[PDB]
Amino acid sequence: SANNPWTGFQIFLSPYYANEVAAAAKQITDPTLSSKAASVANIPTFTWLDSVAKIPDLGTYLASASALGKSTGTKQLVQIVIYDLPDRDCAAKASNGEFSIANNGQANYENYIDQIVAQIQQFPDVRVVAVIEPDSLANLVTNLNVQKCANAKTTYLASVNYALTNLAKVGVYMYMDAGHAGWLGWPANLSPAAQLFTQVWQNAGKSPFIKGLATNVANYNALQAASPDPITQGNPNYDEIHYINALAPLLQQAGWDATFIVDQGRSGVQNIRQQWGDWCNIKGAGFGTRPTTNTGSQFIDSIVWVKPGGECDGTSNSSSPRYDSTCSLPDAAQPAPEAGTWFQAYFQTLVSAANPPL
Description:
Helix content is 34%, strand content 11%. The protein has 358 residues and is of the alpha/beta class. The chain has one domain: TIM Barrel. Strands 1, 2, 3, 4, 5, 6, 7 and 8 form an 8-stranded parallel β-sheet that branches.
């Protein structure tokens, strides 16, 4: 499109991920690898607003970015993930979301959005890009047979709508999560997905700030695969570029010339999964293509690092109340700590296996 949110801006580098990386690099014993690990702190990532407790961090990042831009003559851009739906991750065996539909989820989520908007409103000289609710709308395409998802459908739609509608009022550039090629990229899922995303875009007023869709968030697919990963058998859309090339025209026909961003933060190593759906701490993952607007596709505004590699996807401990058995599969690195906490051994391999090399 004409307006790529990133062009002409300096991305704000998460100091938190930076602090996680710095603490991680000092523990890596090979000197060459330690220095490569430390440099990961210079690679832009998304900040996950996975709870209300993270909202003051957003405020600090906006204010810090504003000052850094004035100190360097740059216009700054802060990258966030909106990730706090009631009954979050409805098809998972476990979720870490603090809100539940049964306990005023809709009002509580609205208040979470209101608090985020109230921060963003105070810093109009900083640009914000938001990924909207990973692991949400995609479930409403393929997983309505999951009763928790069927029962969450109206809440997911209403809450995502509230986020889009109100973040647009403060000029946030938004990409709704749209799964990945092995989820919504199956040819038969493309039209149901397009119908859902376009209804969501319509309900939120077709705001020009709703730029399009984010794919491969927290996943491991190639953007452009040299050859299909065996997990993809049966799906001609075996990588993200095939998925995006197929989905984009369906959105265009609806009047939404949507563009895309693609997570590649853990995509450096292909052919590491037993089954395509295995998502938790996949063993042997490497850091992938660094964020760039040089994407190779008319439809793609940026390659991004949405999930911050090194932060765990979930515990392998079956005694945890947050345990999802996906995190104990033969292709999941174990033992693994609780979701979001630092997984040092996993980070060190992400560095060692980075492709392109760091």
